Amino acid sequence: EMEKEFEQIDKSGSWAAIYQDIRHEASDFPCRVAKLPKNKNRNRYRDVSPFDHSRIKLHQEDNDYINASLIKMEEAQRSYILTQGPLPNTCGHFWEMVWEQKSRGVVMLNRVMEKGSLKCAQYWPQKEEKEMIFEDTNLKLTLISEDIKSYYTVRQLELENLTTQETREILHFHYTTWPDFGVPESPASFLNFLFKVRESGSLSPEHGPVVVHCSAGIGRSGTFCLADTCLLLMDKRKDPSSVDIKKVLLDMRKFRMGLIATAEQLRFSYLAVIEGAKFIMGDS
C-alpha cells in the first residue's frame, strides 16, 4: 500500500518536491466570471477563484456568482462543493446555495478569527433565541442545538425558505482545532471528525453535495475531501493499493484550483488515508 511511498518520500525528504510537481501539473482553466469587476467584493482572496466550468451558480438572474466550486468525483461517485468562508456581504448567497443545491451538511474547518484576523463571517446564529434572516436571499436560519466537544462542534440548524415557507435541517460540522494552513496533527482527530460527518449521512448520494469550507476553501477543504475520496475508492474496491492519492488530488484540481495548500497537508492526507484504511479494511 501507499504506506511504502510515504516511507520513501519521508526518508528522502522529497515532500516539498513531490508537492511542487503537483502544482506544476495542476489544471488551469479560466475564472472569467470570478474576475468581473462586479464580483470583486464577492471574493475573499484575489488569488483564489472558482473556474468558470465548475463554479456553482446561484439561481437568480441578478448576479449568480459565488466563489464556490462543484468538485465532482466521478469514479468515487461523491461530490462536494468547496467554498471560501462567506463574507459579510455573501452570507445570504452562501445559504441560498446551500438551499438550491440541496445540501444537508456544512463542514467548517476554520474559526471565524485566526492569527488575529477575520477569516470568515459569523454566518450562523450562536444562540437559538437570536435567529438570522437573510433579507437579500429571503431565508431564515435558526440554531436548534449544538454538541460542543474537545476539538469540534456539531450544530443542528434549521434553514427555512421564507418564500415557499419550506424547512430543512442542516447539520453544521465545525472543526475548531485546525491551524490555518496547518495540519491537525493526529490523523486520529481528523478521521474521527470525518467519520462523524459520514455517519450523519450528510455525504450520502440521496442529498445534494456537502458544502466544505475553510477561509479560502482550498487548503484544509482540499485535505478533508482528498482523504475522504481516497478512503471511498479503497472501500469500493476493498483494495488500498489501487489508490494513488496524487492522481486523486490532481483530479480534484480540475474542479477548483489550489487544493491542499502546503506540502505538509499533502503529507498529512497520506497519513489520514493510510490510517483510515485500517478501519475501512475490516478493523472497525
Check the CA dihedral 221-226-228-232 and report its sign. Answer: positive
Residue 23, all three cell numbers: 502544482
Active site residue 31: no
Q: List the resolution, Å.
A: 2.5
Element (DSSP H or E) covering residue 265:
helix 263-280
Cβ contacts of residue 134 below 8 Å, gap of 6+? 91, 92, 95, 96, 140, 141
Is residue 82 within 8 A of residue 210, CB to CB? The reply is no
Please report how many Cα atoms fall inside a 13 Å half-sphere around the Cα of residue 221, on the Cβ side: 30
Per the structure, the count of domains in the chain is: 1
Strands 113-114, 117-118: parallel, antiparallel or unpaired by DSSP? antiparallel
Edge-to-edge strand order for the sheet containing 139-148? Answer: 68-73, 78-83, 210-213, 105-108, 166-175, 152-161, 139-148, 132-134
Q: How far apart (Å, rounded) are the C-alpha atoms in residues 136 and 128?
A: 22
Chain-centroid distance, C-alpha 143: 21
Cβ contacts of residue 131 below 8 Å, gap of 6+? 125, 140, 141, 142, 143
Give the domain CATH number at 84. Answer: 3.90.190.10
Q: How far apart (Å, rounded) are the C-alpha atoms in residues 28 and 6?
A: 28
Please report how many Cα atoms fall inside a 13 Å half-sphere around the Cα of residue 50, on the Cβ side: 26
The boundaries of the domain holding residue 271 are 1-284
Catalytic residue among 31, 91, 120, 214: 214
What are 166's strand-pairing partners? Answer: 161
Q: How far apart (Å, rounded) are the C-alpha atoms in residues 160 and 277?
A: 39
